[PDB]
Design a protein around this ligand. Structure first.
Ligand code: SF4
Ligand code: CL
Ligand code: CL
Ligand code: CL
Ligand code: MG
Length: 305
């Protein structure tokens, strides 16, 4: 790090301790922010941590739907984010109106919503899932047909793994960050014939099918615990490469392609420091949304164990 960044890092750590904040970050945050965070993980790990933490003030570094999930789980704690416009482009593509439309079209099918969804959409869900637990959650539902959204690729992954009929909504909700080309895997196979290829379930099927492993970022981080490969090629957002290299410094981690989530990068050292200085921006939800959205979130944990 450089002298000017060094100064903000020290101030952030001092303010965090002084004001009683715990700092939660997602795996795609920039390295300088992961390094000042108290806990870094994927959505399921952040959710589980949000139910276990004891601090009264939380600074969340990620995108809005995650921050609001943490707030829904802690309605009486203060949650702040540095930039409220950090979001996911899939959120705008699924709406309460579309969910009601498809409930009417397919009555007697549960609505399973990926965590990358608005909090208002969550109030209409039967259950929430992340990419790590989507297969298990859907498997434990009684119905052989489910409505799933917004991510079509994750829904199709779930249908392959469960054999259930997964009606995805909207027509083509997808993560642009994970739209790798399958040819990139062909190329690394020739360049690194002994490497293992790990990709995200948000990837298109041709990419998933040519990979050695498919999983959430939390699952990716545990693969080198059981796979001795010297080299791993990583098909997810670039911020996870830094996470992996820090945790397993004696392996090599090659990005499948350079892929950057511009929304995840909206959080900087500068606006994270200002957030602690001003205790803003607070994450505020209508009380009815918290009331109704907590039920499908709690159900997600109930269907895991
Ligand atoms: S990486 Fe993709 S799915 Fe994740 S927040 Fe960014 S755009 Fe959304
Ligand atoms: Cl059920
Ligand atoms: Cl669409
Ligand atoms: Cl290592
Ligand atoms: Mg303020």
């Amino acid at each position: 790090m450089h002298h000017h960044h060094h100064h903000m890092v020290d101030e952030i750590l001092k303010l965090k301790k002084e004001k009683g904040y715990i700092i939660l970050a997602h795996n795609y945050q920039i390295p300088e922010l992961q390094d000042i965070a108290d806990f870094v993980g994927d959505s399921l790990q952040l959710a589980r941590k949000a139910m276990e933490l004891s601090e009264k003030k939380i600074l969340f570094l990620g995108v809005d739907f995650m921050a609001e999930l943490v707030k829904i789980l802690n309605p009486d704690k203060k949650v702040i984010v540095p930039d409220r416009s950090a979001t996911c482009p899939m959120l705008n593509r699924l709406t309460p109106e579309i969910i009601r439309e498809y409930r009417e079209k397919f009555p007697d099918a549960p609505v399973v919503l990926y965590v990358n969804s608005t909090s208002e959409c969550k109030t209409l869900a039967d259950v929430i899932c992340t990419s790590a637990n989507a297969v298990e959650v859907v498997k434990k539902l009684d119905s052989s047909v489910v409505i799933f959204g917004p991510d079509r690729n994750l829904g199709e992954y779930v249908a392959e793994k469960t054999g259930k009929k997964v009606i995805t909504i909207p027509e083509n909700g997808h993560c642009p960050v994970h739209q790798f080309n399958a040819e990139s895997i062909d190329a690394v196979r020739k360049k690194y014939p002994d490497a293992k290829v790990i990709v995200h379930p948000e990837c298109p099927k041709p990419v998933r099918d040519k990979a050695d492993y498919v999983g959430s970022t939390g699952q990716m981080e545990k693969i080198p615990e059981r796979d001795p490969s010297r080299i791993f090629v990583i098909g997810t957002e670039i911020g996870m490469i830094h996470k992996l290299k820090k945790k397993f410094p004696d392996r090599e981690f090659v990005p499948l392609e350079m892929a950057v989530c511009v929304n995840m990068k909206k959080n900087t050292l500068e606006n994270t420091l200002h957030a602690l200085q001003t205790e803003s921006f607070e994450v505020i939800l209508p009380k009815e949304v918290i009331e109704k959205a907590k039920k499908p979130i709690l159900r997600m944990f109930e269907l895991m164990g």
